[PDB]
Amino acid sequence: SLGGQIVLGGSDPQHYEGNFHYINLIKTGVWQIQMKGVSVGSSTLLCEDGCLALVDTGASYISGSTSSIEKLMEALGAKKRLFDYVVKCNEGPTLPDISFHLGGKEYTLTSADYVFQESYSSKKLCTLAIHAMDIPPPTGPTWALGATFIRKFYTEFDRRNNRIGFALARH
Amino acid sequence: GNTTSSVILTNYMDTQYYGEIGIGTPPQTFKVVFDTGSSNVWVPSSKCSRLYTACVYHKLFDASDSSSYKHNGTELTLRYSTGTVSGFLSQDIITVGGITVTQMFGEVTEMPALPFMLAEFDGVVGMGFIEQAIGRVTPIFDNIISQGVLKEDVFSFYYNRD
Ligand SMILES: COCCc1ccc(Cl)c(CN(C(=O)[C@H]2CNCC[C@]2(O)c2ccc(OCCOc3c(Cl)cc(C)cc3Cl)nc2)C2CC2)c1
Numbered sequence: 001s002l003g004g005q006i007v008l009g010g011s012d013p014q015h016y017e018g019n020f021h022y023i024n025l026i027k028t029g030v031w032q033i034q035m036k037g038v039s040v041g042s043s044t045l046l047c048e049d050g051c052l053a054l055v056d057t058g059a060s061y062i063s064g065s066t067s068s069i070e071k072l073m074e075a076l077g078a079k080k081r082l083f084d085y086v087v088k089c090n091e092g093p094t095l096p097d098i099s100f101h102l103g104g105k106e107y108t109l110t111s112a113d114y115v116f117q118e119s120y121s122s123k124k125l126c127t128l129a130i131h132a133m134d135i136p137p138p139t140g141p142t143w144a145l146g147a148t149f150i151r152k153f154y155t156e157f158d159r160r161n162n163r164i165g166f167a168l169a170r171h
Numbered sequence: 172g173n174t175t176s177s178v179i180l181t182n183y184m185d186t187q188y189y190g191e192i193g194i195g196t197p198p199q200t201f202k203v204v205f206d207t208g209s210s211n212v213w214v215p216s217s218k219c220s221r222l223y224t225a226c227v228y229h230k231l232f233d234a235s236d237s238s239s240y241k242h243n244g245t246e247l248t249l250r251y252s253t254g255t256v257s258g259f260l261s262q263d264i265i266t267v268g269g270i271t272v273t274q275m276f277g278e279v280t281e282m283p284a285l286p287f288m289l290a291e292f293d294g295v296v297g298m299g300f301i302e303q304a305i306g307r308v309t310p311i312f313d314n315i316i317s318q319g320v321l322k323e324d325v326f327s328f329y330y331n332r333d
């Protein structure tokens with residue numbers, strides 16, 4: 001069991017599939033790209049007029065603004081706690097797909113990608129791998145696509161071209 | 172150069188992803204997160220009081236065991252939401268995979284217990300841009316690019332699931 005891997009100088013094909021799709025950075029300076037919408041199910045709940053997405057390898061979770069995630073969480077039936085959002089464990093597996101519109105594509109996570117399925121009991125609450133964090137100027141307000149996103153989407157950070165590239169991770 | 176260098180990472184509970192770097196001569200090894208949301212290198216200092224929980228259980232850089240250490244001492248600060256992280260500039264040799272680079276990095280002498288005491292790793296290598304660097308210190312991948320030994324000016328991440 002390999003926990004993960006960084007490649008300096010290239011990428012490892014052994015750990016992704018298909019081909020990289022790329023997105024220009026908005027500005028050199030920050031590993032941030034334009035986002036064109038966040039879906040919950042097949043409907044666009046959020047980020048409808050464009051918004052920003054930081055691609056943050058040193059973050060555990062996917063984060064939005066407090067105002068965005070309140071809305072996202074509304075839509076998931078999820079409950080607010082001091083530090084996290086939870087659902088009742090038995091509904092984790094039925095929770096809808098969440099999609100991130102990035103460049104030409106939808107980047108879709110299922111519930112397996114964002115629910116910590118620690119139980120299946122209705123008596124027990126499961127955490128979500130998505131949090132509210134308000135990031136201040138310059139970088140923020142922005143979403144941040146942390147390890148929750150990077151686990152699903154193998155990622156290349158390209159300095160020569162100031163782009164970021166995504167491939168489906170081979171596990 | 173046609174070199175690509177990899178670094179095996181540890182997945183702790185799907186919440187922390189970190190791997191190994193060496194700092195100094197001979198190398199002092201640290202667990203670090205490679206953080207495209209930041210641009211500096213920080214480790215705990217051997218000067219961080221044992222009265223910091225966040226320091227008391229991680230590995231500390233000791234400049235006085237290192238023969239390639241070069242002193243700087245410029246104080247530098249990070250504003251974290253739970254309290255301030257601070258220390259001072261040092262320069263030494265750092266090895267990431269097969270790669271060796273002379274690098275300015277920050278030695279931390281105080282940080283908040285939360286969240287840092289729960290970090291399973293010791294430090295951080297920022298993989299972002301000089302613009303976001305505190306004190307405009309040249310980031311490590313900038314220094315790796317300047318060695319001109321890489322195949323392409325890119326770096327990639329794989330994160331497994333637990
Ligand atoms: C994705 O894997 C790890 C997720 C994860 C889990 C726990 C913590 Cl506390 C973090 C913190 N963690 C983060 O949020 C980073 C996420 N992206 C932007 C900057 C960031 O917020 C950040 C936050 C703190 C920080 O402090 C520098 C001090 O570094 C140390 C750290 Cl960070 C830990 C220890 C023991 C010693 C030192 Cl000197 N540097 C960068 C930075 C990038 C580590 C990330």
Ligand SMILES: *[C@@H]1O[C@H](CO)[C@@H](O)[C@H](O)[C@H]1NC(C)=O
Pocket residue numbers: 242243244245260
């Ligand atoms: C530390 O290094 C920086 C390099 O940018 C320099 O500006 C600063 O004056 C240095 N302090 C010293 C050498 O004491």
